[PDB]
């Protein structure tokens, strides 16, 4: 009856990705007991964690993970696809000073592992795939495909971009929108024949991108973007040849990358987003992370946004036990932010990948005249609009 006492407030968190584990950690900080449920039986290339996300991780008590595994990112450059020459290059030092943290690219595998380690695998029930939630005046209940169910006071749906709970919260089923390009990504060992080990290097041209950024342990996170129709007959077996075709004529470092990579460990993903929602919560249930907002990766803010969601979620429960009031405040704080992030990503996606090839050529022109000041400013804007400023 006094809801502050241990065992009187139970949150059910669905999903053990970045969002779910962040949310559980944040809820626990605010004195709420969480049971975490995850669909897959076992976990299974990288994420750029900008300073807004880093400060969130620090706030959540998980700062050591970022310091330890974050790649040494200190500068960036854009290179011409033919010449391979610098169009613009500059250090990120100024951004790090304005935002208060260094950027931390981290391998997805390592980030996930460390966060599970931190939360503790024993407090996660795997093979638990949620199908339905229902709420009464007393609480909320969810059902799992294996026939079990669980009840609690609060439900956090952090079940990803294909969220099963999302339709119940919204009242309809949003659909994923193909963003018009395909991303190939993976990891390779740092070889300065490709690019500098402390910088994020992107080759641009023809509405395409080839990118390298350092994660931990002397490795590069790499990705290739190509504007393409969805559904092409292309997989890991067709991979090297596909990339060779798509990037014919591109500077030698790119050919070096295509030869260096391992197709068996390289991901090919057709990029989608979802039109932003105007609601994130319903009763005792809140969407968090990709479940509440699904963006293209184009400004590297997807995982950061889920961390931001969690920080705000913990904060709204810090000094209240009125679930309905807390979740309305969560929604109030998050909804405009994640809308802007999805739309910002979308716009950048469209400029980068030649939706209008002239706008794209104009962007390349701006990169030729770029000192770094305008880009740094733009990045700071995105970062400083986060909950921890
Ligand atoms: C190619 C690419 C590059 C990216 N780069 C960046 C970047 O540089 N920086 C950045 O900040 N973000 C980046 N992102 C975005 C980032 O990866 C995601 O936003 C982030 O992983 C979302 O976390 P999440 O927990 O909400 O979703 P997920 O990581 O997808 O986790 C959801 C979890 O829920 C589980 N689940 C699904 N359905 C059910 C069910 N019904 N019942 C129970 N559990 C279920 C899933 O198994 C999964 O473990 C990138 C994304 C992509 C695709
Ligand atoms: O602009 C991008 N930033 C990223 O952090 C990222 N990650 C990715 O796969 N594609 C992109 N694009």
Curated annotation (Swiss-Prot):
Pfam families: FAD_binding_3. One of its GO terms (biological process) is urate catabolic process. Keywords: FAD, Flavoprotein, Monooxygenase, NAD, Oxidoreductase, Purine metabolism. Pathway: Purine metabolism; urate degradation. Its cofactor is FAD. Substrate binds at residues 183, 209, 221-223. The keyword NAD applies. Belongs to the FAD-dependent urate hydroxylase family. This is FAD-dependent urate hydroxylase.
């Amino acid at each position: 009856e006094n809801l502050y006492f241990q065992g009187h407030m139970k949150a059910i968190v669905i999903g053990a990705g970045i969002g779910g584990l962040s949310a559980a950690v944040a809820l626990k900080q605010s004195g709420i007991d969480c049971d975490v449920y995850e669909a897959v039986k076992e976990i299974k290339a990288a994420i750029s964690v900008w300073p807004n996300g880093v400060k969130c991780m620090a706030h959540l008590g998980m700062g050591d993970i970022m310091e330890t595994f974050g790649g040494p990112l200190r500068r960036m450059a854009y290179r011409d696809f033919r010449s391979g020459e610098n169009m613009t290059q500059f250090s990120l030092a100024p951004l790090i000073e304005r935002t208060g943290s260094r950027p931390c690219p981290v391998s997805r595998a390592e980030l996930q592992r460390e966060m599970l380690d931190y939360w503790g695998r024993d407090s996660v029930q795997f093979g638990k795939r949620v199908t339905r939630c229902e709420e009464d005046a007393d609480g909320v209940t969810v059902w799992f495909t294996d026939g079990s169910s669980a009840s609690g006071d609060l439900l956090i749906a952090a079940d990803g971009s294909h969220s099963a709970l999302r339709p119940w919260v919204l009242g309809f089923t949003p659909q994923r929108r193909y963003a018009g390009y395909v991303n190939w990504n993976g990891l390779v060992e740092i070889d300065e024949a490709l690019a500098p080990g402390d910088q994020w290097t992107t080759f641009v041209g023809e509405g395409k991108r080839v990118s390298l950024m350092p994660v931990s342990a002397g490795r590069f996170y790499f990705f290739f973007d190509v504007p393409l129709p969805a559904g092409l007959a292309e997989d890991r077996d067709t991979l090297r040849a596909d990339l060779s075709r798509y990037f014919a004529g591109w500077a030698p470092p790119v050919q070096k990358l295509i030869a260096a990579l391992d197709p068996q460990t390289t991901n090919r993903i057709e990029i989608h987003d979802i039109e932003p929602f105007s609601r994130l919560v319903r009763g005792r249930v809140a969407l968090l992370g990709d479940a509440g907002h699904s963006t293209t990766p184009d400004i590297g803010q997807g995982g950061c946004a889920a961390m931001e969601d969690a920080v705000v979620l913990g904060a709204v429960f810090r000094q209240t036990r009125d679930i309905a009031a807390a979740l309305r405040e969560y929604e109030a704080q998050r909804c405009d932010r994640v809308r802007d992030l999805v739309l910002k990503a979308r716009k950048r996606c469209d400029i980068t990948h030649g939706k209008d090839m002239q706008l794209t050529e104009a962007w390349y022109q701006e990169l030729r005249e770029e000192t770094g000041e305008r880009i740094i400013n733009g990045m700071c804007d995105t970062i400083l609009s986060g909950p921890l400023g």
